[PDB]
Ligand binder design. Sequence first.
Ligand SMILES: C[C@H](Oc1ccnc(-c2noc([C@@]3(C)CCCc4sc(N)c(C#N)c43)n2)n1)[C@@H]1CCC[N@H+]1C
Ligand SMILES: Nc1nc2c(ncn2[C@@H]2O[C@H](COP(=O)(O)OP(=O)(O)O)[C@@H](O)[C@H]2O)c(=O)[nH]1
Ligand SMILES: [Mg+2]
Length: 168
Amino acid sequence: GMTEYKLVVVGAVGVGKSALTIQLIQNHFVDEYDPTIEDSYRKQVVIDGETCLLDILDTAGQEEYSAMRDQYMRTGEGFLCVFAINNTKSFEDIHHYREQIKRVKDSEDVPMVLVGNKSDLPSRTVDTKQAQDLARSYGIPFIETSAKTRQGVDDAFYTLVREIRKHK
Ligand SMILES: C[C@H](Oc1ccnc(-c2noc([C@@]3(C)CCCc4sc(N)c(C#N)c43)n2)n1)[C@@H]1CCC[N@H+]1C
Ligand SMILES: Nc1nc2c(ncn2[C@@H]2O[C@H](COP(=O)(O)OP(=O)(O)O)[C@@H](O)[C@H]2O)c(=O)[nH]1
Ligand SMILES: [Mg+2]
């Protein structure tokens, strides 16, 4: 049967979680997507010759630590932690997202990729070395992406699927 992988995209508002998701789903860059819409989207993709079913939860909205929201995020098997390379605050937020993922998954070993989005822009404020070094601290991959040009998009999502397989 076809394996389904539940992937969750997290990070500060405005980093491009929806744009990255919709590039994967629609193969189109969408510069405008209601910042409050949290939803999940499925797509069949071939990864290393295996057709699998991706179910991608594009997170949005208010930070809340109810049992319900914890259980919703707990369904994720792997997480993309996204910051924007021209937004230092979004990078400084990453450790909080990672903390919460470890908490709800009750594991120090959750499949996870650090994603530096908006790589097409010239306004870089987060050095690549600093982001690579944070991924090294966590023992996870770092992928540079642009939802606008498609740079890194498959690499980010497909790496997460490969991590989920290894973890199994
Ligand atoms: C960085 C923060 O800001 C925001 C703003 C919006 N969201 C968050 C946020 N943190 O984790 C999460 C997720 C969705 C991540 C996956 C696992 C779980 S489990 C659960 N219950 C979640 C929730 N809500 C989450 N989201 N944080 C700063 C710092 C603290 C105060 N705050 C102003
Ligand atoms: N140049 C550029 N803009 C992007 C990129 N990804 C998202 N954006 C823009 O960043 C803003 C927020 O994107 P959105 O997908 O709504 O972010 P979300 O709140 O994380 O879902 C919008 O103005 C998008 O057009 C990218 O890779 N490059
Ligand atoms: Mg969004």
